[PDB]
Write a protein that binds this ligand. Structure first.
Ligand code: XTA
Ligand code: CA
Ligand code: CA
Ligand code: CA
Ligand code: CA
Length: 470
């Protein structure tokens, strides 16, 4: 093994660094893990398949054009370079190494393709065809975009896309499950809260946020309990950005946003799959939880959960660590079957007013085939009316004491439409025992006299049984 010689590798500070402020990818490469045999697809505006740093790794079997309904995902060229983003993301995953061009991908021996889906009308059918592309050939899908990041939107997949996600995790990859990597959002300036985005908020997606070079929460970041982990991206004008392939056969040093973090995670996941090709979609989320690193990430909300892990709403479990992912993958025993325990909490609607607390002691399906002693995801599916939605903050506390913020105040959200059976999701209680008293808190964070009613609260627990060793 020799370190890459590509001319811009030194500028890929999140890979080439030697000050321990990086993704620890060199450690994985040094053990011989570079993505060989793994297939990744970028869901975006197209991929410049003839780019000098992509052609060597390009895979037509990982690619399709859902906008035009043909196999060739080549983007359209315009003066504003609108359709450059899929190419930038593709190079982050799998730019060719040691070829005198630009830098390298995280998984520089993986195969890379793209779905051209964003250069046209994005419909339920378009989303389903993209998420469901060749699921026994593609291992990992990377999506950097979704519903509007205006801080006012609540939106998620419709029926066909939801079914594609479920079919992907259940039957993709020969039954191991498609791995869907998602960017948690770019709406930080607008005070967006990412559990309002049903793609990143899904249990089926492995959601990723960003850290700046100096280890801070970037201006564009969205906090939420559904995020799992973090990779480096852009920040202020003293901090470096992401260096990758660009449209028109170029190299950029100015790729930015959480949309640049998801592809780096997809690349790390490709190295991990090469290390253990038998990992399921759930195994991969377990590995991320166990191995990600809070060290040197600054946040004001780090808290230790019931099993002793530090977690943040900006960062999830912390920075991805490629060396640690590959090491744990080699020792991992695949997890037991997923159980799902549905608990109807309310006996009657509850006035919200200024503040509401709902407490319920649960058994997590004790005595039944879906009894859960080892939690993975948890959802609170809430139906509520309120006069000004963005004034609400919502928290969920587990029996072991872990407080998850399900919704922070969104000052720009003046909707009067409330939430209709919306499944706010938290990863912060992973591995906890969910038996005991849960607490839901709903608060009006404004001085206004706001009003509404909580009409349904369904607590949904996922996980496994067996002795909980935490
Ligand atoms: C510079 N770039 C310009 C283009 N851009 C962009 N981003 C995002 C974009 O809208 C969207 C919108 C959605 C939301 N959904 C909800 C259900 C609706 C059903 C219906 O009514 O039929 C249809 C719309 C989802 C997605 C999406 C994105 C990916 Cl990557 C993968 C999947 Cl699966 C879904 N995308 C449109 N353009 C990114 C920035
Ligand atoms: Ca085409
Ligand atoms: Ca290169
Ligand atoms: Ca958002
Ligand atoms: Ca997710």
């Amino acid at each position: 093994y020799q370190e890459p010689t590509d001319p811009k590798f030194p500028q890929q500070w999140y890979l080439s660094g030697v000050t321990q402020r990086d993704l620890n990818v060199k450690a994985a490469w040094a053990q011989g893990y570079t993505g060989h045999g793994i297939v990744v697809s970028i869901l975006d505006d197209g991929i410049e398949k003839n780019h000098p740093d992509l052609a060597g790794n390009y895979d037509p079997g990982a690619s399709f054009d859902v906008n035009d309904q043909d196999p060739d995902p080549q983007p359209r060229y315009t003066q504003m370079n609108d359709n450059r983003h899929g190419t930038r993301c593709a190079g982050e995953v799998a730019a060719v190494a040691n070829n005198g061009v630009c830098g390298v991908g995280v998984a520089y021996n993986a195969r890379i393709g793209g779905v051209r889906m964003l250069d046209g009308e994005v419909t339920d059918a378009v989303e389903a065809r993209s998420l469901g592309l060749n699921p026994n050939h593609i291992h990992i899908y990377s999506a950097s975009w979704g519903p509007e990041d205006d801080g006012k939107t609540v939106d998620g997949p419709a029926r066909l896309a939801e079914e594609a996600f479920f079919r992907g995790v259940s039957q993709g990859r020969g039954g191991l499950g498609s791995i869907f990597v998602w960017a948690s959002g770019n709406g930080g300036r607008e005070h967006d809260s990412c559990n309002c985005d049903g793609y990143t908020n899904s249990i089926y997606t492995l959601s990723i946020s960003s850290a700046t070079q100096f280890g801070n929460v970037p201006w564009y970041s969205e906090a939420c309990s559904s995020t799992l982990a973090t990779t480096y991206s852009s920040g202020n004008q003293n901090e470096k950005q992401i260096v990758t392939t660009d449209l028109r056969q170029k190299c950029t040093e100015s790729h930015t946003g959480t949309s640049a973090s998801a592809p780096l995670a997809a690349g790390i996941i490709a190295l991990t799959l090469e290390a253990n090709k038998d990992l399921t979609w759930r195994d991969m989320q377990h590995l991320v939880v166990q191995t990600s690193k809070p060290a040197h990430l600054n946040a004001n909300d780090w808290a230790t959960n019931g099993v002793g892990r530090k977690v943040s709403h900006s960062y999830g479990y912390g920075l991805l660590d490629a060396g640690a992912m590959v090491a744990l993958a080699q020792d991992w025993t695949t997890v037991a079957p997923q159980r799902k325990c549905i608990i109807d909490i309310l006996t009657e609607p509850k006035d919200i007013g200024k503040r509401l607390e709902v407490r319920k002691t649960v058994t997590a399906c004790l005595g039944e085939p879906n009894h859960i002693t080892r939690l993975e995801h948890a959802q609170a599916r809430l139906t509520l009316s309120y006069n000004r939605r963005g004034d609400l903050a919502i928290h969920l506390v587990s029996p072991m004491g872990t407080r998850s913020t399900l919704l922070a105040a969104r000052p720009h959200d003046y909707s009067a439409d409330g939430f209709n059976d919306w499944a706010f999701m938290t990863t912060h209680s992973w591995d906890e025992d969910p038996s005991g008293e849960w607490v839901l808190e709903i608060e009006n964070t404004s001085e206004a006299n706001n009003y509404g009613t909580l009409t349904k609260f369904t607590l949904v627990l996922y996980g496994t049984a067996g002795e909980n060793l935490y």
